[PDB]
Amino acid sequence: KELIEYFKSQMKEDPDMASAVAAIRTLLEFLKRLRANLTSAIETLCGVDSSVAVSSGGELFLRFIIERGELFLRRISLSRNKIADLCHTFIKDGATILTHAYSRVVLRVLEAAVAAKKRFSVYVTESQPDLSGKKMAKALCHLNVPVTVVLDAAVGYIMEKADLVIVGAEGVVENGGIINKIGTNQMAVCAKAQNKPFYVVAESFKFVRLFPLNQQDVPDKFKYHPWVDYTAPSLITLLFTDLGVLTPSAVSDELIKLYL
Amino acid sequence: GSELSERIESFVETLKRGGGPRSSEEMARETLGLLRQIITDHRWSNAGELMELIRREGRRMTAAQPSETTVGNMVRRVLKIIREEYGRLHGHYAQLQSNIIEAINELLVELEGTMENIAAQALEHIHSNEVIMTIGFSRTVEAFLKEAARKRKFHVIVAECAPFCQGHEMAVNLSKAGIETTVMTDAAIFAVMSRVNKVIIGTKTILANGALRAVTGTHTLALAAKHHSTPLIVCAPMFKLSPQFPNEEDSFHKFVAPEEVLPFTEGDILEKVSVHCPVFDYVPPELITLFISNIGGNAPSYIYRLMSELYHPDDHVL
Amino acid sequence: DYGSKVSLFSHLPQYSRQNSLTQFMSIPSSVIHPAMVRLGLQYSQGLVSGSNARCIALLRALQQVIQDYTTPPNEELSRDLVNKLKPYMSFLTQCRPLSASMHNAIKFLNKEITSVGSSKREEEAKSELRAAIDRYVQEKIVLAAQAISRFAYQKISNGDVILVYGCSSLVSRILQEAWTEGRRFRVVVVDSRPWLEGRHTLRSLVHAGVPASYLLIPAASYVLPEVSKVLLGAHALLANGSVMSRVGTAQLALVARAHNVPVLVCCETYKFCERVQTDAFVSNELDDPDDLQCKRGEHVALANWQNHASLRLLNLVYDVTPPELVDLVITELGMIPCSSVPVVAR
């Protein structure tokens, strides 16, 4: 299209951002050079990059919005630091961390914990569909952390050796659940069956107007061998966002206040 | 002032050494009076100076003893009141103090009569010939139970505490009320958890996720209640609300001398045996049914709504 | 009271359908307005049973009374209207216990009356009172139902199997609107003795072309595995998040949870109550025990149940539903979790 070149260039240039961040950059960089065309750009960006984060970021930008556009990304730049500072406290010395996929937010949380003079072990899931657990392990090993990689089928075998579970989230729904990698629901079920804490770390621009009841309520445009799944809010212990620590039952009020 | 400094030092020393007043309401009243005295006889012109002085004093008092939370709650409420008064007067640097004194008086008159409001709801929750199970000594729970005994007759089961048998005083106080109570050891909590229809217990503080920090052994009672599906309802005042999460502080259960558990005259084996005597336990919010407050019974999932209006989020760190 | 009640329900009244109190009343009633006595007779006879229908009838009777009301000399309308309406409410409660909707309506009417200006003319007071009542009825029933139906339409897909219980004017409207929009599905109707109110909605669905099935509540476990979604109505919303509805609802939700079936509850914002309840014993309504008699075979087993001193008949009507068994609650403002109704209601 007329913006896919910018989208691909932005994805290639800097690796720190996310798909939603890249969509936001494309949007406010094309803003200078309106509702209908902005909505069309958001729709085509979501069609090219099938992820709820891109749609959430585009909708939040459209609601928030030239002088007012800088505040959104200036805030979300330090939102990750705020979330890491809030979340690094909950890690104790000698604990075992169980991660599933590769996400920069939990990497920042773990690096803040290790900078706070703490020692812990990390278990990562290899992420069979697209190998990302190996990438996360290779990016975390040079932090002087004893990180090991396990199989997707070994989640239920290492559950008894883990003290707490920390995973990311690509989107938060009204009832308080999350939309994460396909192998996240089984990990949450296993953690619940063994009374293991389940901590979810996510930002504020990943809120969607979705109220799924099961795995069939997720829209087909987001799952596409599905790529994502739905996690019940009853299997989540706590949520760490830039708006402070939130209980699963308190996500609905914050979503209502944020105006999706 | 010299009097202010000496009063602050005396309060800090008496809180750190062995604690102040036994009842939480008296501690809250003393803290509010100390904060009002600090606000009144001090030199300041901008609200920021008063806010930072109050924050420093609250930090010192909290560092004196982390087990208690009433002082921190009072400091947070005073800071929220000061912020709201500044916002009202600005949205004012010489008459705002009168507003602080008026608001402190309003908080005091709302606070000291909390027990009457808590006990005015015993009829709807206690019925005739209903077994009630409780553990420890709680003034609020005692007032809740003794207020409904005039109209209805029921049975109360009291569980003692192994380190300090403070439940026997509650048992005898309820027995001298025409209530027909009974007492037993801590090892029979699950054994008699069959004919109990309702469980009412107190707490020291309420966490930000609806969790509780009650006396030791309450976790077992909550687990037994969940296993037998008997509802567990806790009546606590509004000043026991702490806007904090259990972030692995490891100071949740304060430890005392092992003399209460194992006598010093045991012999030479004391050099090898390691004895721990915790006094508090952690109760997850999933084992709580209802929370009695001055605004009526609230679900354990409604604590964040009260926290959003009680304490400013910028003062959560203090 | 009629008959002998059980020990657990000795604090609740138990009336009879034939013990009408209009016999000891003047035919041209003057102490009680004819509209109120007619409404009480209809309530006792069971002519009106819907939760919204009773409130609509009560508000219509109140409007009729206000229309033909004159102000007493040297007495303000706002200071005496409530005192005059109080005996009417007491008589209506004596005829049949009120519901949450009626309580909310009378509370709103009292608030409106107390706010009437003293200098306002009596005819103006009556006209504005009638207009306010009509606007309240509109915005609280016919504007809320459309929003609830629109919100629930997004949760209905082709091939779904929806299970309903009892009779509800809101669930039926949602189902008919969904069928008219273009959705293709089938409904399951569950009934319980002795009201058997689900036959009304079964007939309504049949005449609308929507396929339906009929079975009793003891056999709900046999049909739940093939049921995709469960739609239930609500009579009142409590302050602790629990839902008060027909007595056959809590066990249905429990069995649905045991079968891993989502449970949806639809209710309006005007049915919220500032009350906390845990069991159906502290607050309930007892109906006529004689309705439990059944014509099975050639005789009735409970024809002379009163002749036995140790025989008791219990006729629970309402019950409470814990929030743990409710997944989604749909109101007129949007879809919300069951554990978040006090935030939006107040």
Side-chain angles (χ1 to χ4, degrees), chain A residues 2-11 13-28 30-48 50-64 66-260, chain B residues 1-246 248-318, chain C:
Chain A
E2 71 273 3
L3 53 140
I4 312 302
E5 45 266 8
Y6 192 152
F7 202 50
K8 293 302 298 187
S9 85
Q10 192 39 104
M11 302 273 315
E13 284 146 15
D14 210 292
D16 76 340
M17 48 80 246
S19 323
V21 198
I24 288 178
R25 304 148 169 268
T26 305
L27 289 175
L28 82 186
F30 266 146
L31 167 52
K32 320 84 152 63
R33 286 95 34 85
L34 305 182
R35 327 266 82 81
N37 57 65
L38 282 203
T39 321
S40 66
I42 292 168
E43 284 327 285
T44 186
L45 275 173
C46 189
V48 151
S50 73
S51 51
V52 317
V54 171
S55 97
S56 327
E59 203 156 7
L60 275 175
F61 197 133
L62 203 264
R63 181 151 10 252
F64 192 36
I66 179 65
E67 286 328 287
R68 216 167 165 210
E70 295 83 344
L71 254 287
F72 205 75
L73 69 186
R74 284 316 303 137
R75 201 258 175 109
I76 72 149
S77 38
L78 50 99
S79 82
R80 216 177 244 150
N81 287 345
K82 296 192 25 161
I83 300 180
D85 289 1
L86 256 45
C87 194
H88 93 278
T89 305
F90 281 78
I91 300 180
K92 67 134 188 173
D93 298 47
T96 308
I97 316 296
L98 178 53
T99 335
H100 183 258
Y102 159 72
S103 43
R104 146 79 70 180
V105 181
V106 76
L107 181 53
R108 283 221 91 266
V109 169
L110 287 201
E111 86 158 277
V114 90
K117 310 189 154 335
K118 299 184 192 161
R119 336 190 322 280
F120 54 91
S121 325
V122 192
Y123 277 98
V124 203
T125 281
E126 61 172 18
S127 266
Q128 196 28 68
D130 49 337
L131 280 196
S132 266
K134 295 223 200 274
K135 165 199 225 284
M136 155 90 111
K138 113 171 295 281
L140 194 129
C141 194
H142 83 64
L143 263 40
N144 254 15
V145 184
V147 50
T148 91
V149 200
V150 309
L151 288 155
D152 275 272
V155 167
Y157 175 76
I158 65 170
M159 209 51 246
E160 65 185 22
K161 307 216 306 213
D163 280 5
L164 62 144
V165 175
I166 319 181
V167 296
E170 305 144 333
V172 198
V173 284
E174 265 163 340
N175 45 324
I178 60 167
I179 302 181
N180 213 35
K181 206 83 164 182
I182 188 62
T184 321
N185 188 87
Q186 32 171 12
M187 170 183 291
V189 166
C190 291
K192 170 68 70 177
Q194 299 227 291
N195 316 102
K196 300 291 183 181
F198 196 88
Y199 299 116
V200 169
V201 197
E203 287 105 324
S204 80
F205 64 92
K206 298 182 177 203
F207 285 176
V208 285
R209 267 304 192 203
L210 296 183
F211 210 122
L213 293 149
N214 39 41
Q215 317 281 349
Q216 282 96 72
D217 284 29
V218 191
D220 270 289
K221 67 168 290 193
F222 293 142
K223 292 190 298 186
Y224 306 100
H225 275 354
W227 279 84
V228 300
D229 61 346
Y230 165 73
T231 310
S234 34
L235 308 176
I236 306 177
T237 299
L238 224 47
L239 271 95
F240 302 101
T241 62
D242 37 354
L243 309 174
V245 183
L246 289 190
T247 41
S249 321
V251 194
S252 170
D253 312 352
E254 295 301 5
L255 219 171
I256 288 161
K257 173 154 48 224
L258 186 76
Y259 297 156
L260 56 138
Chain B
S2 149
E3 51 269 347
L4 177 140
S5 171
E6 75 203 11
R7 164 129 188 224
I8 285 180
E9 246 95 44
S10 150
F11 183 70
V12 164
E13 292 309 314
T14 195
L15 186 63
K16 154 155 34 194
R17 286 220 199 81
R22 321 298 279 260
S23 58
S24 303
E25 328 153 46
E26 276 165 38
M27 188 111 66
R29 170 155 28 90
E30 191 178 31
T31 305
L32 273 159
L34 174 56
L35 289 159
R36 184 239 317 276
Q37 202 208 292
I38 288 166
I39 291 162
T40 42
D41 40 71
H42 229 301
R43 272 261 57 81
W44 51 268
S45 307
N46 193 266
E49 298 209 24
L50 183 56
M51 292 216 249
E52 54 88 13
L53 165 69
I54 289 296
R55 230 179 247 120
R56 168 150 31 93
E57 294 315 303
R59 209 148 42 200
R60 282 203 27 196
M61 299 190 259
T62 305
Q65 241 292 336
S67 204
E68 49 84 14
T69 59
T70 323
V71 202
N73 298 334
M74 293 320 133
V75 174
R76 263 163 228 134
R77 291 241 35 195
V78 162
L79 282 168
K80 169 68 174 181
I81 287 184
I82 292 178
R83 290 200 82 159
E84 98 172 17
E85 287 314 300
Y86 185 65
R88 286 212 300 108
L89 258 74
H90 191 68
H92 45 284
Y93 295 132
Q95 57 296 48
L96 185 138
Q97 200 201 268
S98 36
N99 319 56
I100 330 292
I101 330 303
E102 286 147 41
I104 288 172
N105 296 316
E106 286 173 31
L107 229 175
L108 280 163
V109 53
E110 155 190 356
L111 166 154
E112 75 290 65
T114 300
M115 188 144 320
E116 316 328 342
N117 303 48
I118 298 279
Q121 301 170 32
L123 294 324
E124 352 169 2
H125 296 102
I126 311 186
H127 306 313
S128 316
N129 299 296
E130 209 194 37
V131 192
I132 308 271
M133 170 91 101
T134 182
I135 176 176
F137 205 164
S138 199
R139 309 305 219 280
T140 327
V141 152
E142 194 218 25
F144 191 86
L145 262 42
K146 250 169 32 178
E147 187 272 349
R150 333 165 311 182
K151 314 279 191 151
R152 314 196 175 102
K153 171 249 305 175
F154 41 80
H155 195 13
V156 174
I157 302 203
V158 168
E160 72 180 35
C161 309
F164 332 106
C165 325
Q166 250 186 300
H168 299 176
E169 313 172 4
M170 167 96 153
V172 300
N173 283 12
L174 291 182
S175 100
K176 288 142 72 270
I179 293 206
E180 192 42 63
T181 83
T182 176
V183 86
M184 86 273 198
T185 30
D186 286 85
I189 282 182
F190 180 69
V192 308
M193 249 289 173
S194 317
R195 76 288 319 268
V196 171
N197 330 120
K198 211 158 280 253
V199 175
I200 289 122
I201 46 176
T203 184
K204 180 93 169 186
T205 189
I206 312 176
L207 300 186
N209 66 325
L212 294 180
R213 182 201 299 176
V215 311
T216 180
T218 44
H219 200 357
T220 296
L221 190 88
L223 282 175
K226 198 55 170 294
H227 175 270
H228 282 271
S229 213
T230 77
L232 189 132
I233 169 173
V234 159
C235 33
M238 209 76 280
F239 52 74
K240 290 187 176 182
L241 223 55
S242 37
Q244 60 189 29
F245 293 91
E248 52 92 45
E249 314 171 333
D250 222 309
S251 50
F252 210 75
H253 343 106
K254 58 132 81 153
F255 291 87
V256 298
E259 168 66 31
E260 284 93 37
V261 172
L262 209 52
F264 196 81
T265 81
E266 269 291 89
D268 46 330
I269 77 173
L270 295 185
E271 61 176 325
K272 309 140 197 178
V273 179
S274 100
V275 183
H276 295 83
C277 188
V279 320
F280 289 140
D281 269 29
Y282 178 78
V283 182
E286 329 285 340
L287 308 181
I288 320 293
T289 310
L290 202 72
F291 273 112
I292 280 142
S293 168
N294 311 327
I295 34 169
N298 282 11
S301 330
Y302 204 65
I303 318 294
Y304 73 90
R305 235 332 173 83
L306 316 173
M307 232 84 86
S308 319
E309 46 151 71
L310 272 186
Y311 316 105
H312 207 266
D314 272 320
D315 309 314
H316 287 178
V317 61
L318 190 59
Chain C
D1 274 39
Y2 170 115
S4 82
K5 305 181 299 180
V6 310
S7 66
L8 320 93
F9 288 100
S10 316
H11 55 275
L12 293 176
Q14 179 175 287
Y15 301 155
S16 148
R17 292 279 293 261
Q18 318 294 333
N19 84 14
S20 45
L21 64 98
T22 168
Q23 29 197 309
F24 332 98
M25 290 183 60
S26 152
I27 287 321
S29 268
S30 286
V31 61
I32 298 188
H33 215 264
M36 245 45 75
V37 78
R38 177 160 18 201
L39 186 59
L41 207 52
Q42 287 177 352
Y43 283 167
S44 37
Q45 287 189 5
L47 261 63
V48 180
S49 33
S51 169
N52 294 292
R54 291 163 79 182
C55 170
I56 287 277
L58 171 50
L59 277 153
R60 256 57 193 169
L62 285 152
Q63 262 188 133
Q64 196 40 263
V65 152
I66 292 174
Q67 163 63 37
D68 48 59
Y69 165 109
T70 180
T71 166
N74 250 319
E75 220 180 317
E76 280 329 280
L77 190 144
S78 35
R79 276 190 44 82
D80 72 52
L81 197 47
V82 192
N83 294 78
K84 217 202 73 176
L85 286 181
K86 267 195 283 287
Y88 302 147
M89 290 324 132
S90 147
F91 161 74
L92 285 191
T93 316
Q94 261 273 63
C95 280
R96 179 148 225 142
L98 307 184
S99 45
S101 35
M102 284 190 263
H103 279 302
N104 286 266
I106 64 178
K107 280 166 58 180
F108 152 75
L109 207 29
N110 291 319
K111 287 166 189 177
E112 193 68 74
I113 290 156
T114 324
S115 302
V116 174
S118 321
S119 323
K120 274 285 196 61
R121 304 205 331 265
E122 49 152 356
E123 58 268 44
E124 291 178 356
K126 294 178 301 179
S127 206
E128 276 61 343
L129 258 286
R130 290 167 55 91
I133 287 180
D134 271 326
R135 179 192 316 150
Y136 167 81
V137 158
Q138 189 97 0
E139 297 175 350
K140 260 67 175 57
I141 311 276
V142 305
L143 296 189
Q146 302 171 1
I148 290 178
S149 99
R150 253 151 48 183
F151 285 146
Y153 168 70
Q154 291 147 26
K155 275 256 153 283
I156 297 183
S157 39
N158 301 75
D160 267 316
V161 182
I162 314 178
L163 179 129
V164 300
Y165 172 71
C167 176
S168 193
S169 99
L170 189 57
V171 180
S172 316
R173 180 167 187 170
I174 290 176
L175 292 180
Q176 263 93 312
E177 294 232 281
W179 185 266
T180 317
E181 278 294 327
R183 302 305 200 192
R184 289 300 167 266
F185 54 90
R186 62 193 193 98
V187 201
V188 176
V189 185
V190 193
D191 255 324
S192 74
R193 293 190 66 250
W195 303 279
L196 299 172
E197 257 150 350
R199 296 183 177 179
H200 317 142
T201 179
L202 174 77
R203 297 197 125 239
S204 77
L205 286 179
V206 160
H207 288 132
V210 196
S213 174
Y214 195 87
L215 72 140
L216 294 167
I217 214 153
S221 266
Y222 167 98
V223 86
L224 254 176
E226 77 201 40
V227 158
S228 147
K229 286 190 185 68
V230 170
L231 204 57
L232 301 162
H235 281 260
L237 286 176
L238 303 188
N240 63 16
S242 57
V243 178
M244 214 204 66
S245 58
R246 201 44 65 108
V247 77
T249 307
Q251 101 168 15
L252 215 60
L254 170 70
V255 181
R257 150 79 38 102
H259 279 269
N260 306 129
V261 183
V263 176
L264 275 81
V265 166
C266 33
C267 197
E268 290 101 311
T269 61
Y270 90 110
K271 291 185 178 181
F272 179 66
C273 307
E274 312 256 358
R275 198 210 322 169
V276 163
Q277 200 163 346
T278 316
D279 46 353
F281 289 78
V282 84
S283 172
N284 209 16
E285 172 182 341
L286 255 58
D287 221 286
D288 195 24
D290 281 332
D291 290 358
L292 290 188
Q293 298 174 344
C294 66
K295 184 45 162 26
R296 279 300 305 171
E298 50 301 345
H299 60 271
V300 192
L302 302 182
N304 291 331
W305 70 274
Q306 274 172 308
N307 291 346
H308 302 89
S310 325
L311 190 45
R312 294 265 137 69
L313 265 65
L314 185 58
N315 213 280
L316 294 107
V317 177
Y318 304 92
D319 64 344
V320 86
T321 306
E324 322 145 40
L325 310 176
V326 186
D327 294 64
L328 172 60
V329 168
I330 313 183
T331 72
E332 75 211 60
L333 299 174
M335 257 156 306
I336 43 162
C338 179
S339 321
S340 162
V341 280
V343 178
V344 61
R346 92 214 325 174

